[PDB]
Amino acid sequence: WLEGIRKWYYNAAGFNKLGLMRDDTIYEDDDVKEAIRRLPENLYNDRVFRIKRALDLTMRQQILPKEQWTKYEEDKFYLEPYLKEVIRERKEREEWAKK
């Protein structure tokens, strides 16, 4: 039901077409930058290569072959725990600042 429309949006958004994953496309604010610098090196190198390949594909206005597109289930939110921890720590610092 909801998973149907979410899967629709996943296909509608093209980051699977470029071989990217959802966390690769997040906007790099300060929290995102801290989360990135907290990534383990394997995850970090995978991220940079994915983004480089995507930028290359967009440069030539081409898309990755259909079999190599990311799968909605296979997509893994590598950055989510680190980003959540960064956000939680920032929230605590703000809360201490409040009073």
């Binding site: 429309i5 979410r6 949006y9 996943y10 509608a12 958004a13 093209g14 980051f15 470029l18 990217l20 959802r22 690769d24 496309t25 997040i26 906007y27 790099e28 940079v48 983004i51 480089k52 995507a54 930028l55 290359d56 967009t58 440069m59 939110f77």
Partner: protein
């Protein structure tokens, strides 16, 4: 020894600015419109300086001076129509540029975006004052209405309006003032462009994907230089087609009758670029409300960064936001069309609906849709 390009101070600045500036490899043709704006500004400055060598700003001689430029001056017609159509090309490229900024989330570069809004205001003022200079019927009466719009401001109001007019109504003082201001403003625009480029270089350039491209950067000199030259050639193709094949396509014919303060032209409309704001103004009946709406139409670009609720910078991977963005573009086209058309029964309601939809799309629909998208992507 050292490389002169790196070492020498002025050459160092030029090198970092244009030669060896790290640029993303994937920026598309939409990014060429900034360099196209620069070329348009330079062409306008040269063209207007050469026009001013033959233009006298007195009301008795202004229209006769433009006729002298068109007829007697060697290749004067080429220059005059290059200027007139270059203004339209400037505004086309500005609209496309701001559209690119909205679509690809380039507004996150806060200072660059704000300096850009300031530049848009300056360019619009420059064009509005410049259109008065030929002193045709349309020039005089458009100036009358647009300056009379300022009377809606409470208190200062009439005082400010007459101060700008230099008198009770638009007259010789206003024409000369507009000539002087139209001369000086492009140079301020040129300086603000340098400020704009500085702020952008602080943060680099955004890519169509919207993801940081520090991993994939290419030197500007060996690539985007020839790309921008190709874009400039295409722009010259379009502009020269306008200048030569259809010289009076984007201009109202009623600017060729000398201005008569005692007779209103059959229709009073601003130039095509101002038409959407003219329609927005006409939509609201109250004068002060119309002026505030006209100001807000442009100032909403200031609020655009604050209204960004999506987790993805660009709309490339936001299909619903893409649909809303193209609805906004169609709405702007509709507003232009309404502004061209007279204020009668069919067009009044269309204009009101278009204005409401424009503000709604920018303020409420786009942020809510972005939030829905984030929820869809399991954020």
């Amino acid at each position: 020894m050292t490389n002169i390009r790196k070492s020498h101070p002025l050459m160092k600045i030029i090198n970092n600015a244009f030669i060896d500036l790290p640029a993303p490899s994937n920026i598309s043709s939409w990014w060429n419109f900034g360099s196209l704006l620069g070329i348009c500004l330079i062409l306008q400055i040269l063209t207007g300086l050469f026009l001013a060598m033959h233009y006298t700003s007195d009301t008795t001689t202004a229209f006769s001076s433009v006729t002298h430029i068109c007829r007697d001056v060697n290749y004067g017609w080429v220059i005059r129509y290059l200027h007139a159509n270059g203004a339209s090309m400037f505004f086309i490229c500005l609209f496309i540029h701001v559209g690119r900024g909205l679509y690809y989330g380039s507004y996150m570069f806060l200072e660059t975006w704000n300096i850009g809004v300031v530049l848009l205001f300056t360019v619009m003022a420059t064009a509005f004052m410049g259109y008065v200079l030929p002193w045709g019927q349309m020039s005089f009466w458009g100036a009358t209405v647009i300056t009379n719009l300022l009377s809606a401001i409470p208190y200062i109001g009439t005082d400010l309006v007459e101060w700008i007019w230099g008198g009770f109504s638009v007259d010789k003082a206003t024409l000369t003032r507009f000539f002087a201001f139209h001369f000086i403003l492009p140079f301020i625009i040129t300086a603000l462009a340098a400020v704009h480029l500085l702020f952008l270089h602080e943060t680099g350039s955004n890519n169509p994907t919207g993801i940081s491209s520090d991993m994939d950067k290419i030197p500007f000199h060996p690539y985007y230089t020839i790309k921008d030259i190709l874009g400039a050639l295409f722009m010259m193709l379009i502009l020269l087609i306008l200048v030569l094949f259809s010289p009076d396509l984007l201009g109202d014919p009623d600017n060729y009758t000398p201005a008569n303060p005692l007779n209103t032209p059959p229709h009073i409309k601003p130039e095509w670029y101002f038409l959407f704001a003219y329609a927005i103004l006409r939509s609201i009946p109250n004068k002060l409300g119309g002026v505030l709406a006209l100001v807000a139409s442009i100032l909403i670009l200031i609020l655009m960064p604050m209204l960004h609720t999506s987790k993805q910078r660009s709309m490339m991977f936001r299909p619903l936001s893409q649909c809303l963005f193209w609805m906004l573009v169609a709405d702007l086209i509709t507003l232009t069309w309404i502004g061209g058309q007279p204020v009668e029964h069919p067009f009044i309601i269309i204009g009101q609906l278009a204005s409401i939809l424009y503000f709604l799309i920018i303020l409420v629909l786009m942020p809510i849709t972005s939030i829905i998208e984030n929820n869809l992507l399991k954020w």
